[PDB]
Amino acid sequence: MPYFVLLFKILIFCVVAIATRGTLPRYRFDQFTQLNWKHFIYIWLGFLVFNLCFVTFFI
Amino acid sequence: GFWIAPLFVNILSLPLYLVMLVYNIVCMLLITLVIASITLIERKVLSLVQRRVGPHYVGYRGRLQYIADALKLFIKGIVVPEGSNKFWFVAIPSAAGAICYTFWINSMWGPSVSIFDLEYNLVYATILSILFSFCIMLTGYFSKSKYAFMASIRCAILMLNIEIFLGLLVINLIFISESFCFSVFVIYQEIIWLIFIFFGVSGLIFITFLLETNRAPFDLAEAESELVTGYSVEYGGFYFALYYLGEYFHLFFFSMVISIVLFGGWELPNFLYLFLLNDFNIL
Amino acid sequence: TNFGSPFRNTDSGIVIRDPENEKRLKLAFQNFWKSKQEDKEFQAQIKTAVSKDTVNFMFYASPLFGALLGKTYIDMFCNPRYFYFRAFTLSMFALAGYCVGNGFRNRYEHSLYTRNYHLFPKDLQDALVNGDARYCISWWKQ
Amino acid sequence: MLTWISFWSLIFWLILIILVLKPKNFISILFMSELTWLALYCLSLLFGAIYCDITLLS
Amino acid sequence: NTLFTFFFLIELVSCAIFYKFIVSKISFKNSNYKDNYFSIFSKNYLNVLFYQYWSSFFSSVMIGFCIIYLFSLTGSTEWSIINFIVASNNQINYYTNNITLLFICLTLIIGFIIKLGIAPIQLYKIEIYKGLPFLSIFFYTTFY
Amino acid sequence: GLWSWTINQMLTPKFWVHLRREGFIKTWTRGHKASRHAHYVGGNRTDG
Amino acid sequence: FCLLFVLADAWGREKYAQPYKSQILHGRQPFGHTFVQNYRNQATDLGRWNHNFACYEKQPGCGRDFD
Amino acid sequence: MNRSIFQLWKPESPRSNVNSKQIKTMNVNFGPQHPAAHGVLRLILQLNGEIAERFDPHIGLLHR
Amino acid sequence: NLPWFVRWGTDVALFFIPAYTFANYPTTFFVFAAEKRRQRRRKDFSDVKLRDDAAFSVDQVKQLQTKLHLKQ
Amino acid sequence: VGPLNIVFAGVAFLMFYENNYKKLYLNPRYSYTMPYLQSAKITKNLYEKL
Amino acid sequence: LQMWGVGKIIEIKKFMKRRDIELKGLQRKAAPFMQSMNDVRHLALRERNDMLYNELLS
Amino acid sequence: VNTAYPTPLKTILKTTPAFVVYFVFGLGFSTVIYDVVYHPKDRIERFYFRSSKFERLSRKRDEKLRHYFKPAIEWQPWYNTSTNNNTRPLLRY
Amino acid sequence: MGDAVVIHLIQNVLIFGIIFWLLTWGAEYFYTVKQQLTKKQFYECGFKSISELNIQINFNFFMLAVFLILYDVEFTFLFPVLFNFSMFSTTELFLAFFFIFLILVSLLYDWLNNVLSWSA
Amino acid sequence: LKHSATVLREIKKDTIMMILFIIGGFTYCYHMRETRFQLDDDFNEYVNTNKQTFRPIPDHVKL
Amino acid sequence: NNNLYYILLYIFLEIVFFGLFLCLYQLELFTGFLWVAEFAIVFIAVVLLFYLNIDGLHLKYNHNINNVLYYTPSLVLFLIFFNIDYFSELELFLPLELSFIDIYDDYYEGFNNSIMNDFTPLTLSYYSINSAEFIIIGLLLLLGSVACVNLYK
Amino acid sequence: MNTKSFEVLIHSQYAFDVCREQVYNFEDCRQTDTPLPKDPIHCKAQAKEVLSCYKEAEKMDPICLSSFNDSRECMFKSDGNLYNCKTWINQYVTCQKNPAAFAEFLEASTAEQLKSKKFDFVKNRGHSDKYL
Amino acid sequence: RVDYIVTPINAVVSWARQGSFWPLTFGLACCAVEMMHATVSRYDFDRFGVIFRATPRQADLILVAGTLTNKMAPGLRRLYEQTLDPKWVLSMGSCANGGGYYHYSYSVVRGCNRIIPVDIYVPGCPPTAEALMFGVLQLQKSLYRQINEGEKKYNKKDLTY
Ligand code: SF4
């Protein structure tokens, strides 16, 4: 069944998460909020707008 | 007897409910074992990255560290401080644990292979996450300690950004799937992994994965260097064990969702052999 | 196949792995195409989204253009003393070109098998739609 | 017990009344207003179910 | 042309009125030199904001309830069609439940009086006018 | 406490030589005696 | 800029066939929406609506069933 | 960007209740047994909204 | 006498092949029962109505099935 | 107990008996509604008595 | 990559649409008999209720 | 000669037990879920939400006819139970 | 989105929690604890806490919370349109673009006022 | 950043290559759209092979 | 109850009960949407309560005076005469065996319908007919955001 | 009037080309000026004729028993996905149309085609299936 | 008839308690610096399962490492009381043992045993990482053994009466 492939992918993702916990530091609360409140949301919205334009072009 | 048979309707029905409860308990035990294995894998990976051998004396080559950890967490006693409401201090762990085990319901292991026919798996997962965040915040607030209050405030601050980021990511993802069920994403991901379309949003996807799992650099509400222990500053034993188990289950479920929605789901990756793969087999 | 046959699902719930039936169907299709291969009226009636000459040109020049582009890319940014990296880039470009050519050829074949699907015999059309050579035995048994 | 329409209308009216019954706290007023808005949304959903109108559900 | 659009436009107008009320200057340049080391707690702006917000909430709830009830009655919220159906009811006597019509009319009238600040609900408007600038009062009167 | 010497470690000439020399009891007991690494059972070199 | 490019492409898609005409410039919605937005409308004059086919009579390919 | 000085400063005026710290000061302490307090410091820090307002480091906890 | 890759392949095979079998057969030991249920799900001749003007009778159909040896 | 308790118990027992008898003896047994009483046999036609 | 993925998704949707067109043709081939059975069920139930009402309100 | 694996290979390989334990636990949970889904219905039934309107109508026709149409077609005046514990309607009002 | 099956699952989850509670009681059966002076006191890194209930925060993220609520409402509004984008039309595209532009303008105005940063 | 002449030439080459790659990607997307349209036409032709029956609506349905 | 935390818990319970009622009426989509929105609002309200009512000591108010003085007779009178139900009836009014509208099915309509999502009415309403209402809602949201910024300033 | 959904669907698909007269009459009787269907009492005669034709067409040839069983298994595994079982359905339809020609086609069967058709919509998925 | 299962239960409990002897993240001076070095990759306390816990309410092993003064003794007593039961105590370093160099200091607690009960002591000043590991191993062995120390006497049926 595909459950084995799903488990392998989830295990890879969990290993990546554990490595990220081991490696990177912890940022500031205000810094992360501002990054979300100024850059990340706008980037996501622009990506969605570009996807909408591409879908319209490709019908 | 024609007159004795009637009085046995619910009497015969009860065994079916008992069997269903037994099956649910078996599923819960399997999920707990999976979570314990995930914790063991995390400890081993952390030791390996730190150039440390890690757990090796817990049984044969330290193969049963998780079972010993769970048993010891059971063993240690817990005392409620007199300065806090015992009712709330106890209800918070029980509510968190009840919400924690419910994550197994909104999970699919294959095509139409699910415990329930929930067409809004994403909504159910979001509700579970919101309940877990509320439980953490309440545990922080009920502790009546400044450190726990700061931890709860930081967790709430994370949640608002987490909620917005998750909603935007789902909306951008639902723009292709057009369904709140998890099967639709994997159905159209058999050609290529969904990360290909979101190639430029790979950094934001990784950020969301690290935030949905409450890992660094979104490791707030833990603040080991900053605010010592997290919402469990005064909570220990079974409360801390339940909180950690819920965190691990949430991480596992978020990784499963991320795989099912972005990394090709449970379909084998054919993107590498795309240059040699055919499109249509015309006779 | 990424999309599979347009007339049926590749393997819906049961995966069929019979090569004898596929070979018989291919032979029957070849025999049907050869029986009216000299029919000028049938030849003119056959229409495809892509011409055979254009399809052949695409399939024969796509690897060449891709290889040239890969060589130019390796010259532009890659150092020429990295044999592994240069060969990998060139092979990837050639594989992309081959994929483009294969897509063009598959499109031409599908158009030939679909835009002319109305001229097929009844049993031949049944075999093409169902993927089973048992629909038309006389064109493949002998 | 009571029919759904009657229950919903009586609940809306009782919530409107109870909005004044409790003490005068701004936070309590805001919570009561949120509850009343949710009850209004529920009533609109029930009405759209009763009459099968797209605008009612909108 | 319909009570839904009217309700949306009225809610927008109420939001604009609240925003304009929030735009009132809290401090002014005065020659009052004796109050430099003492605090004067003025609650006029807060009272105006609270009263406006609560009245707007109540009026919006009433108008929404009225619209929801009217839609179920005839199936439409437009201007002419509603009047035609209501006049037809007086001639066909299909719906004799005058209680529901009286309740809908009472809800609409109460909502309109509350939004307009009509008597006997007048202390709200009295307090509203008592804590605003003269130009703001002029604008509010012209709008209402 | 099972599988002191794994199949990968047991699939070496060193394991066979040690088992033939010191016996099964000594071969198994070394893994329980001074377990440092599964690949370091009886030494790192696989020749003996 | 993406929106402008998409609009330009849609405007240039007029040379494409009617099925290949831009969906923005040529709507294609469900049968219910088609019946609701084109009933008793004199601008289009879509003719009758075959209840068997759930499509307007003037609509191309209406009622095309198996022979 | 635009000027945001007022959003960063909040001085206290004589007998001005508005200008005072109109909030219960979270007099939390970075006491000895803290992972980041180095063990021998009790930094009583008046923090307002997780931002330290005043500092009083109780030292000498390890004075030998 | 064994390569590092050759020895490592044994553990990988032990981890993969049993896992592959378990994934391919989630319903262990009940496959025969499932096959029997599927066979009983195939209706027989009497359970269905047969047209009066049928090319082959029941006995002829059985003989032809035996000759062609269809698994069914 | 008491006379009222006895009356209530009798009424509840009669209600349970009547409901069960109606569900069992007076019902088209086309749907599996009585576990351990309705049969689990696999049906082939649309209407099969359970 | 975003453009190519959007195009591929569009192509997959078109292929699914063709498959759905074939399925719709099959369903329309199967439309009449089910509709006839459902109409027979609806009309048979109508006769019994109509007769009961006629005997009742008479 | 020494046939030991590479140092990075061994360093990564000192996780195989935990990885295999996690895989076994996940396989057990997945098999339990699959058995629960399959045993009641003798198959893995597709969700009605993943089926079109025609498919959904075709799937539930037999169940609807058996559970509702049959009792409604052969109703009796005394058939209804004296209590309120009857079968609820297909649409809850 | 849930059913009586989900309700019974919640009941079984509660049963599992009761089993866990029984296990906790069994584990606690093997321990003995002596009451201490500060045994039930607040843990504040070794000293008695100077507050019991007066733990108040500055709440510097009020504007952030309000903007989050507004953005959630806007996203919920946008969701139904994208849920059935396959039947998009010219008017639908115009409305979606207008909604996107409005959300972007709101975000920019929030950023333009420096309201996305904490204040004293 | 006072980059060298070689770095400037490399940057110019990279910009030209990026522009060319963008143009090529757009052309490939247009070609893919045309191919999809052709495939859709072929599929419609295949589907409408034996579905050419057109029964007029009965006169019982009024205008 | 006057305790703000208990009031919030009761509001959350009422919202959950309303969602359950909506699910009972087979309206699960709107139930889930309302549940999510209410959960977010409840999180914000809990943050505010920790901000403004950390102690939780509610005002010393007694409900007996107001309840006995006006509230009880007013509630009795209001519930006594208010009845806006014209023709709504209970489900147990008639035997379900006399109803057959849920058994009829439109096979041709199903064969002519390609809808696979329940959001079709929502799209057709908030995108086709009530587009003016949607634009008004967007403008109102922008104006409210501006007003909130001005209020914060 | 005693058939399951899948069996009745298979029988009607087989008779889709055989019940043309009654089907066309009923469809014409089903015509209306709006998408709302007409009252079922309007076409009692046409519906009765269609049902009679379906009952008369449900009797298949003996050679179609195996094909019908295979189609039933495919539909049950697919929970009634007709397009995914097009090959078996088409074969059964050809068998019902001509049992003799279908028997001759079955004479030229392959070894793989002579094995039991085991359908599993989980391990095997298909290619770009919306009904999945 | 309750000791039969209890003995296996006691053994399992002892194994579990030894497997999760989490040291308290509470260090003061050079002895604590050595203890932190004993948490390094080279000295794998994770091999024995020692993971530092910041909260006394969730800690089991109190690693008293450093010098105790008059300004820290009440805090140490409060932490010891706040430590969740069961608890073990190990005093590493001479200062934590008996003051060490500051044994004659006016600002020295003059011994950690006079403030909180101590189960084990380490001699070195600073003790080596190996010395701390040996002390931890001895404490773990004692804790595993102390659970069933044969306090109860065996009856004539070889049953603890
Ligand atoms: S005992 Fe020695 S090493 Fe330890 S803290 Fe005292 S002086 Fe330093």
PDB file of C-alpha atoms in Angstrom, chain E residues 55 58-60 62-63 66 102-119 121:
ATOM      1  CA  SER E  55     -26.303  51.735  19.563  1.00  0.00           C
ATOM      2  CA  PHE E  58     -28.119  46.971  18.595  1.00  0.00           C
ATOM      3  CA  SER E  59     -29.481  48.652  15.458  1.00  0.00           C
ATOM      4  CA  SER E  60     -27.509  46.347  13.160  1.00  0.00           C
ATOM      5  CA  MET E  62     -32.360  44.516  14.738  1.00  0.00           C
ATOM      6  CA  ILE E  63     -32.006  45.318  11.026  1.00  0.00           C
ATOM      7  CA  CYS E  66     -35.804  42.150  10.254  1.00  0.00           C
ATOM      8  CA  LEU E 102     -46.543  43.176  13.653  1.00  0.00           C
ATOM      9  CA  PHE E 103     -43.284  41.818  15.080  1.00  0.00           C
ATOM     10  CA  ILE E 104     -41.385  42.524  11.848  1.00  0.00           C
ATOM     11  CA  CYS E 105     -42.808  46.050  11.655  1.00  0.00           C
ATOM     12  CA  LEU E 106     -41.975  46.677  15.320  1.00  0.00           C
ATOM     13  CA  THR E 107     -38.418  45.441  14.787  1.00  0.00           C
ATOM     14  CA  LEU E 108     -37.930  47.660  11.729  1.00  0.00           C
ATOM     15  CA  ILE E 109     -39.384  50.742  13.432  1.00  0.00           C
ATOM     16  CA  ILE E 110     -37.401  50.204  16.641  1.00  0.00           C
ATOM     17  CA  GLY E 111     -34.196  49.752  14.653  1.00  0.00           C
ATOM     18  CA  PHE E 112     -34.852  52.912  12.647  1.00  0.00           C
ATOM     19  CA  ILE E 113     -35.624  54.924  15.793  1.00  0.00           C
ATOM     20  CA  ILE E 114     -32.511  53.606  17.547  1.00  0.00           C
ATOM     21  CA  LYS E 115     -30.286  54.389  14.554  1.00  0.00           C
ATOM     22  CA  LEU E 116     -31.822  57.852  14.165  1.00  0.00           C
ATOM     23  CA  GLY E 117     -31.871  58.320  17.950  1.00  0.00           C
ATOM     24  CA  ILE E 118     -35.612  59.032  17.954  1.00  0.00           C
ATOM     25  CA  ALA E 119     -37.424  59.558  21.238  1.00  0.00           C
ATOM     26  CA  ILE E 121     -34.417  56.784  23.008  1.00  0.00           C
TER      27      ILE E 121
END
